[PDB]
Design a protein around this ligand. Structure first.
Ligand SMILES: OC[C@H]1O[C@H](OC[C@H]2O[C@H](O[C@]3(CO[C@H]4O[C@H](CO)[C@H](O)[C@H](O)[C@H]4O)O[C@H](CO)[C@@H](O)[C@@H]3O)[C@H](O)[C@@H](O)[C@@H]2O)[C@H](O)[C@@H](O)[C@H]1O
Length: 138
């Protein structure tokens, strides 16, 4: 197991055709998960499953620039379940991050941060047991 919150360095940032794979298990009674693809203090891509926001489950995606969160992009398709193992695949494509969970496409998030090669860390946090976090070029 990896200790959460976990920092995965992304050496030289991200680039199209880079695939980031996160394996873990959601804790029982989880409230949140977060992936934070960071460009320094900025969060180029925040991917945030919320298990109980006003008694609904939703994935909130956003970008944080100069400590300001921007416009949220929300996805009510919610493939995570408390207690269950998951796989998150984040594929960097030219215009967006493409996220699949458990081998099913979930969402895309258009690049707001343009300096992809400066998005050099992925923070993984929240109510999970983290099994692995890695990347490969496909
Ligand atoms: O429920 C409606 C909401 O309306 C006002 O807030 C508007 C404000 O909401 C969001 O701003 C933040 C974002 O931080 C949270 O979400 C990001 C991802 O987007 C991260 O997950 C953070 O960890 C979360 O804490 O949410 C609070 C407000 O709820 C702000 O302090 C944060 O900036 C949204 O991202 C942003 O665009 C939008 O302007 C109202 O203030 C709220 O009380 C609430 O009624």
């Amino acid at each position: 197991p990896l200790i959460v919150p976990y920092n995965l360095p992304l050496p030289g940032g991200v680039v199209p055709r880079m695939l980031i794979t996160i394996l873990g298990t959601v804790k029982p009674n989880a409230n949140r998960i977060a992936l934070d693809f960071q460009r320094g203090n900025d969060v180029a891509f925040h991917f945030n499953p919320r298990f109980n926001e006003n008694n609904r489950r939703v994935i909130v995606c956003n970008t944080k620039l100069d400590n300001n969160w921007g416009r949220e992009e929300r996805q009510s398709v919610f493939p995570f379940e408390s207690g269950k193992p998951f796989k998150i695949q984040v594929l960097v494509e030219p215009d967006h991050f493409k996220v699949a969970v458990n081998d099913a496409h979930l969402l895309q998030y258009n690049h707001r941060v343009k300096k992809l090669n400066e998005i050099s860390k992925l923070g993984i946090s929240g109510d999970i047991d983290l099994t692995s976090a890695s990347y490969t070029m496909i």
